[PDB]
Design a protein around this ligand. Structure first.
Ligand code: PEB
Ligand code: PEB
Ligand code: PEB
Ligand code: PEB
Ligand code: PEB
Ligand code: PEB
Ligand code: PEB
Ligand code: PEB
Ligand code: PEB
Ligand code: PEB
Ligand code: PEB
Ligand code: PEB
Ligand code: PEB
Ligand code: PEB
Lengths: 177, 370, 164, 164, 177, 164, 164
């Protein structure tokens, strides 16, 4: 995998260029906003058990045919195998937000995920809904606009980190269409 | 098991990443391979096994030895007799994986729920970490099953010299990416069998029969799914960057890219005939100066003043080294490298176009609306 | 690509774990030490044609036997590929100061180097005399700071310890 | 014991490497974060007789149903074992603030807890009600410093997410 | 695998015939020229380290894009795995020169080699003009007409062994075409 | 196909080696022994239908119970399959003297034979009476030469040790 | 070791088979070609002091940089351990002409030689320049016969292709 630092290296290795002064300044600004990012990913991994229960119950709360006999989340064993698909998608986003890159999302999390979902008989559109509910939850903790849990932070604004973690959940839903 | 077989066949091959017993301080292979881009294999080296390394060990058991499936909290109660003895040290890593392979967990998934042809497929993958080498090695194991059934066939892998020379008694088995392969076509088959990090083995069809009899060739996009991912490429893949268009728009865009690659081949072949014509143009004179006495004025012995030509001076070595060499055959060679770049760019574009056509035809053959 | 981030993501992904407090604490050391190694990365990116020319003819003034016929400096294409390799190695040290780990020297410069230099008959003591010339001409207040010298020299003798 | 030390040693040993600059920079963030979490540790080690009294009566007010005859929370000698358990969980959180990782919670408090609390019929909702009260009682300038209450509260809800 | 004598048995097994007297006239002339065959594979195996370094570094003389950044022979892991692959091809060609029959080259080496090289990103046109430098090297070592090294043989004529190992080398380039 | 050449290549391929001097020295002993066993092969190639009528009833004179009803060889369409089977086995001995090893007897005649004859109710001792009659009916200066009848009668009792 | 006898016994030991007619046919080639290679063994065993003295100062007439201070062959004790090592390499060539295979060079001279000579900074071009002098100083009717000189100079460039 790569991070935010070795994405600049593999883009300058294609040109045989040293890492100069212009793209060092975009990396020097990554480190200066580094305490925001560790404050950001601490917000999501502290609330991660409530998020995967708010997600896949609300997917069932909109789609009540998934628990009918002949549904994907019908029995008790298949419900735990959707709860396990909540917290792996949420885990690999949490590595991608911590790294500053979407390498670990691409070659591990989405690698072969659609081809598995065809062969099992997973509903395609219902996985787009439960990921986007987790997109609605993740920006609610980065912007601290959650309804029943408030977390204390320093004074400032982190609207750029909430947009970066929103683009990671759209990359999950774009791969399993 | 002291006889284990009965057949006077011709012997098949081994790997090359084995314990050698002569020069055991050698790296050998797995220093220039795709071993470097996997996570490193887990061997038990401490007797204690603290509880976050116990959980990290069994995740490698479900990913590599099981088929990236999910064990529940009742299916992990069937291994609780075997987790007495692996954690204490009474049984080995090799005897633990065999006890996993004779469970009611493994026999429900990989024996009864799949076919017999699919069951022999995974035993080369789950236990040895490779493919069948050829059909002769695979048809031996149908006779080991015909003699003594399941536990005779399962013990054929763990009681082998190819097992203990590679995994030993301590490492969990893994898919092996060594350098030299025993046929070349067993490399393509192990990338078909273990392909993609998020891919399970549940409800997949049997794959390795028609490749092993040279009936169905393995498509090159199915090997790309098996290979571990490198950071740098010449041509990074548009696997995620193909737009969601129909099946008919994917068929037109594939046949256009196959046609552009055919015309790019037969102007690269015209570049090679111009390189062969450029060398024959100068071969009467390249041999004429082959036996002349060409003595320079400086540059070779250090007793004379050479200036910047002690080596070369200050940036003039070039990006490559061959770009600073002049000549008619060096100048048509740089035209070859710019013409082979455009052919390799569009040959890697028909690979991920062929993936999207197969991944849309799996939707159609599954019972659906399109 | 061994960084601080990939050595703790792959540790947490192996046990099936979320990034906990030991993972975030190590990224705070990536913040606290980047000021020393990015100062050496910007001195290397702005001075590199003079430091690989000076180290490149430390090889050729020491080993005059390479210019002999049949030997390893014989024509001009072979000398130009020698200074290209010192320029390849000093670019990979510069990539290692950016990522904070030995990853670009590992997979792009060191893995397979002893097989290539033996097959093509290239003396790996002539590579080491180029690298150890650069490691011993570093003046720690004139050329960078004090703790930028200990990040520059640490990746320099990671390369000497792996080439020989 | 997953500290920041035993993940860079335990990953260099899986590859057979010396400790590199990637491995020393993880320990540099251990020197930065130790001024806050050891300040939160000895704040907890003096106060702990009153916090676990505050942690125990919160779940007997939230779940007062246990004092029925026939189901679980019968007598005072059971209830004194419930104050034994929340003092043990605060003692492990004090041990994690000295380790610098989720080590002592994982192997002494978390592992096997899904089997002990199930077959002895102990609902873990009463434990989360005992210990989310101490997550909310923390006033960030009164009790400790600013970032010392960050690392106190972040080991606490790791214990909440493990139980429920 | 087969050799030259197993090849004439499976032709005779196809008609269920005995290996008679007229087809033993040609087998006795194979074994009469069997000392030139061992004298020919000894002139390839003795020169085998310089054969794959004259060939891989002569492939670079006709393609500088391999040693450009991003190239196939660019980095040290990639030049080492190409010098590995060039002597696997020389190993299985010398097996078929020794065995008298190209059956060990066609299924252990050349089967599935083309679509192996598509998937890794190997330029297959550069491999064809790499194994054709080794074809011209081998037929100079059989017929003792290399310019920098002469070996000591008995007098005679090994042109039929030269065009048998030349046909094992354009059987390689028909498989990666 | 086990021969001399397909076991020094299959051993050199199994260690990743070029053919060395000990591999070229084994092909030389294939040249020296080739005058002997190819004299034995052309003796068997013309005289094959005589020696299988002579050896086929040597089974039937020893075992006259095969022509009982209920037994193996009742009718004339089963006796001619028994004379087909000896001519199958004598053809493979002629193939083994050409290739210089026990290749074509192994995968074509020996492998799977002990489950064919056991299931189809054929006694294996009636097969071996035909081979062992042919072993001592050979006259070592009359039919072939001295050491050429050594390798004819070496593949005959390899078949005898395999069938029982 | 690796010879004709160790190859066909180990191939039958893996298969679990008796030594059959293909195995004895290969040791017949150990009878024919031993007259050539044991002539070259006793020619080397009686002349070895003069041919390692000649091949050792062909190494130092070519790579004259080794006698510099700080280089390899600095003082006389370090030059005398070079002639110690050319004498070990000629003695393993003599052991390979006796056994009939590359096994004594394999196990005792070639295995581990890349790891040792890299970590002690010994140039492998110096060892190759000693062996390649001896292969070119050989005269095919003066020093031995025409068949003894093609076995002797086939273990010499087994060692040139395994070092380089
Ligand atoms: C049906 C019975 C049913 C639903 C439909 C679904 C409603 C729903 N809720 C959200 C959003 C969130 N869930 C969140 C998680 C939590 N909120 C908390 O306060 C605690 C801390 C935590 C649970 C442990 C969060 C943070 C959100 C975001 C907004 C919010 O604060 O409410 C959605 C997503 C909106 C979308 O579809 O985009 C839906 C549909 N839950 C049901 O039970
Ligand atoms: C660029 C600098 C460059 C080339 C262009 C390319 C030249 C080249 N050479 C051949 C042919 C041979 N190489 C051989 C190898 C060796 N010769 C020896 O004597 C030693 C033992 C060995 C090296 C260790 C041989 C024998 C030949 C055959 C020619 C001959 O008779 O000598 C070709 C092949 C032509 C083709 O494409 O068919 C080319 C292009 N090498 C460079 O380095
Ligand atoms: C064509 C490739 C050559 C050439 C070949 C000839 N070789 C001849 C004789 C010969 N070579 C060897 C050694 C060989 N036998 C071995 O057992 C081993 C290794 C273990 C090797 C390398 C021997 C023993 C012989 C002599 C055989 C004999 O004379 O009976 C030869 C002579 C005629 C022939 O043998 O048929 C030829 C023509 N010579 C050439 O001119 C080209 C270059
Ligand atoms: C003692 C055990 C025996 C006995 C043995 C003798 N055998 C002699 C010669 C001999 N044996 C063979 C065949 C052998 N050589 C092979 O290459 C193979 C297999 C591939 C086999 C089985 C041959 C060809 C020869 C003749 C050797 C020659 O012609 O020089 C022999 C004579 C010794 C000799 O001539 O060198 C003896 C004494 N003889 C006995 O009386 C007892 C019972
Ligand atoms: C839940 C939100 C879904 C749904 C999910 C199901 N998934 C089932 C099995 C399954 N899921 C995965 C993907 C997972 N493994 C990975 O390695 C990664 C990423 C790296 C991910 C996301 C796999 C591989 C499998 C198969 C193996 C297994 O059995 O665990 C599943 C069970 C299928 C069955 O009944 O046999 C279900 C129900 N279904 C839904 O309705 C929502 C959309
Ligand atoms: C100068 C100190 C030496 C010398 C240099 C040569 N290297 C040659 C080939 C070569 N070197 C490498 C390693 C280099 N390439 C990389 O990509 C990187 C790291 C990013 C490094 C260090 C490779 C892969 C190759 C082969 C490809 C190429 O030509 O660039 C080389 C050509 C070999 C030859 O023609 O014999 C030279 C000359 N070698 C010398 O001769 C002096 C002592
Ligand atoms: C004769 C001395 C025996 C005997 C022989 C019978 N064999 C019968 C069938 C049979 N045999 C074979 C093996 C044979 N075929 C091959 O291709 C080769 C090797 C290349 C061998 C050795 C096969 C495959 C079969 C079945 C097909 C066929 O009929 O040819 C047979 C008929 C059995 C039946 O009809 O029930 C007989 C009678 N039986 C004798 O009396 C002595 C023991
Ligand atoms: C002359 C060509 C070189 C040179 C020679 C040195 N070799 C040194 C040590 C060494 N060599 C070996 C391999 C050798 N020992 C064996 O037992 C066998 C095979 C049977 C061989 C080929 C070993 C194991 C060792 C280390 C022990 C020893 O001293 O004998 C060596 C000493 C290294 C040192 O002390 O620096 C030298 C000097 N190296 C040179 O300096 C010239 C150029
Ligand atoms: C990016 C990496 C990098 C380096 C490692 C150095 C390497 C280096 N040093 C010198 C150059 C020099 N280095 C010294 C040595 C000195 N020793 C002392 O005790 C003094 C503190 C100091 C002098 C002020 C001297 C005297 C020169 C002058 C020119 C020479 O000697 O050739 C030069 C030539 C001109 C210059 O830039 O100064 C270079 C490229 N420079 C770099 O850009
Ligand atoms: C070990 C783990 C670890 C952490 C969790 C953080 C903890 C943390 N975050 C911040 C510091 C900060 N944190 C935020 C974050 C936020 N403010 C908001 O309004 C958003 C709601 C929210 C995150 C999404 C901001 C805006 C700052 C100030 C910027 C800065 O100090 O660089 C600081 C102060 C840094 C300083 O003093 O300079 C600290 C210690 N750091 C660590 O080392
Ligand atoms: C160092 C780590 C560590 C822990 C995490 C705890 C975990 C733990 N709790 C209990 C054990 C117990 N826990 C309780 C507590 C309760 N049961 C009830 O009836 C109430 C609902 C609830 C109050 C909260 C009781 C009563 C026991 C005694 C066994 C029993 O339930 O009958 C035991 C059995 C031994 C004992 O009796 O103490 C253990 C190991 N103890 C440890 O040593
Ligand atoms: C190391 C861990 C640790 C803790 C989590 C706290 C837990 C705690 N809180 C209080 C006790 C208190 N804490 C506060 C402070 C506040 N109450 C609020 O509701 C506001 C949010 C905030 C003031 C702005 C007050 C006012 C009391 C007394 C009454 C009460 O509990 O509210 C007490 C009683 C004695 C004391 O004040 O210390 C204890 C032990 N103390 C600790 O030592
Ligand atoms: C049975 C026979 C047999 C073979 C023929 C080879 C075939 C082969 N080559 C490579 C692997 C490779 N092959 C090349 C080769 C080349 N790039 C070029 O410039 C040249 C045109 C060409 C040869 C000189 C490279 C560069 C790699 C490594 C890919 C990379 O890491 O960049 C791999 C993948 C190995 C791995 O990584 O595990 C395989 C199976 N192996 C075998 O087992
Ligand atoms: C068993 C291993 C073994 C060897 C490989 C040789 C190696 C060898 N050759 C010569 C010695 C010689 N070799 C030659 C031969 C020739 N010079 C030429 O230029 C012609 C090409 C060729 C003629 C056929 C001559 C003329 C000498 C003596 C002159 C000299 O070189 O000192 C000597 C010195 C004295 C002698 O023995 O003759 C030695 C040790 N001897 C051995 O014991």
């Amino acid at each position: 995998m790569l991070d935010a630092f070795s994405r600049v290296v593999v883009n300058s290795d294609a040109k045989a260029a040293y890492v100069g002064g212009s793209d060092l300044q975009a990396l020097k600004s990554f480190i200066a906003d580094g305490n925001k990012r560790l404050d950001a990913v601490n917000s999501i991994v502290s609330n991660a058990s409530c998020m995967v229960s708010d997600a896949v119950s609300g997917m069932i709360c909109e789609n009540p045919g998934l628990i009918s006999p002949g549904g994907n989340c019908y029995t008790n064993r298949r419900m735990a195998a959707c709860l396990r698909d909540g917290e792996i998608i949420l885990r690999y986003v949490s590595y991608a937000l911590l790294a500053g890159d979407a390498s670990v999302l691409e070659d591990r999390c989405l690698n072969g995920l659609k081809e598995t979902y065809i062969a099992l008989g997973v509903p395609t559109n219902s996985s787009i809904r439960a990921v986007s509910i987790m997109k609605a939850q993740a920006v609610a903790f980065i912007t601290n606009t959650a309804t029943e849990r408030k977390m204390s932070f320093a004074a400032g604004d982190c609207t750029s980190l909430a947009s970066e973690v929103a683009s990671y959940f759209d990359r999950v839903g774009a791969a399993i269409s | 098991v002291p006889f284990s077989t009965a057949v006077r066949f011709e012997s098949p091959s081994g790997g090359l990443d084995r314990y050698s017993r002569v020069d055991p301080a050698a790296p050998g292979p797995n220093v220039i391979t795709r071993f470097l881009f996997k996570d490193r294999p887990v061997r038990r080296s401490d007797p204690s096994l603290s509880e976050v390394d116990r959980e990290a060990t069994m995740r490698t058991v479900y990913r590599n030895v099981m088929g990236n499936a999910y064990v529940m909290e009742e299916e992990r109660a069937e291994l609780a007799t075997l987790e007495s003895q692996f954690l204490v040290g009474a049984i080995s890593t090799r005897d633990f994986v065999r006890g996993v392979a004779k469970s009611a967990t493994y026999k429900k998934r990989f024996f009864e729920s799949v076919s017999q042809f699919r069951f022999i497929e995974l035993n080369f993958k789950h236990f040895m970490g490779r493919a069948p080498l050829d059909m002769a090695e695979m048809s031996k194991h149908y006779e080991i099953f015909a003699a003594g059934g399941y536990d005779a066939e399962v013990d054929s892998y763990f009681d082998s010299e190819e097992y203990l020379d590679v995994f030993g008694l301590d490492t969990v088995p893994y898919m092996r990416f060594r350098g030299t392969y025993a046929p070349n076509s067993t490399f393509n088959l192990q990338c078909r069998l273990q392909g993609g990090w998020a891919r399970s083995d549940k409800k997949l069809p049997m794959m390795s029969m028609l490749p092993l009899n040279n009936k169905a060739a393995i498509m090159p996009h199915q090997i790309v799914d098996g290979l571990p991912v490198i950071p740098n490429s010449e041509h990074p893949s548009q696997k995620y960057n193909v737009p969601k268009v129909s099946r008919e728009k994917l068929q037109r865009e594939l046949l256009i890219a196959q046609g552009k690659a055919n015309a790019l081949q037969i102007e690269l072949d015209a570049a090679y005939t111009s390189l062969a014509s450029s060398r024959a143009f100068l071969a009467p004179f390249a041999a004429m100066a082959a036996d002349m006495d060409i003595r320079p004025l400086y540059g070779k012995n250090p007793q004379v003043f050479a200036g910047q030509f002690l080596g070369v001076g200050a940036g003039q070595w070039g990006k490559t080294g061959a770009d600073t060499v002049r000549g008619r055959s060096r100048r048509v060679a740089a035209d070859i490298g710019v013409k082979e770049f455009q052919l390799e760019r569009v040959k890697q574009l028909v690979v991920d176009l062929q993936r999207a056509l197969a991944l849309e035809d799996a939707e159609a053959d599954a019972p659906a609306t399109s | 690509m061994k960084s601080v981030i990939t050595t703790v993501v792959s540790a947490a992904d192996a046990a099936g774990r979320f990034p906990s407090n030991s993972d975030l604490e190590s990224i705070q050391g990536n913040i606290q030490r980047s000021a020393a190694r990015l100062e050496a990365a910007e001195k290397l990116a702005g001075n590199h044609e003079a430091v690989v020319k000076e180290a490149g003819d430390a090889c050729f003034a020491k080993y005059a036997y390479l210019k002999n016929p049949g030997e390893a400096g014989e024509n001009q294409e072979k000398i130009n590929k020698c200074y290209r390799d010192v320029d390849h190695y000093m670019r990979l040290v510069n990539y290692c100061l950016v990522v904070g780990g030995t990853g670009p020297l590992d997979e792009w410069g060191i893995a397979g180097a002893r097989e290539v230099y033996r097959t093509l008959n290239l003396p790996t003591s002539a590579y080491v005399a180029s690298i150890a010339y650069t490691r011993d001409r570093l003046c720690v207040p004139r050329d960078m700071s004090a703790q930028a010298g200990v990040e520059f020299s640490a990746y320099l003798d990671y390369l000497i310890n792996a080439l020989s």
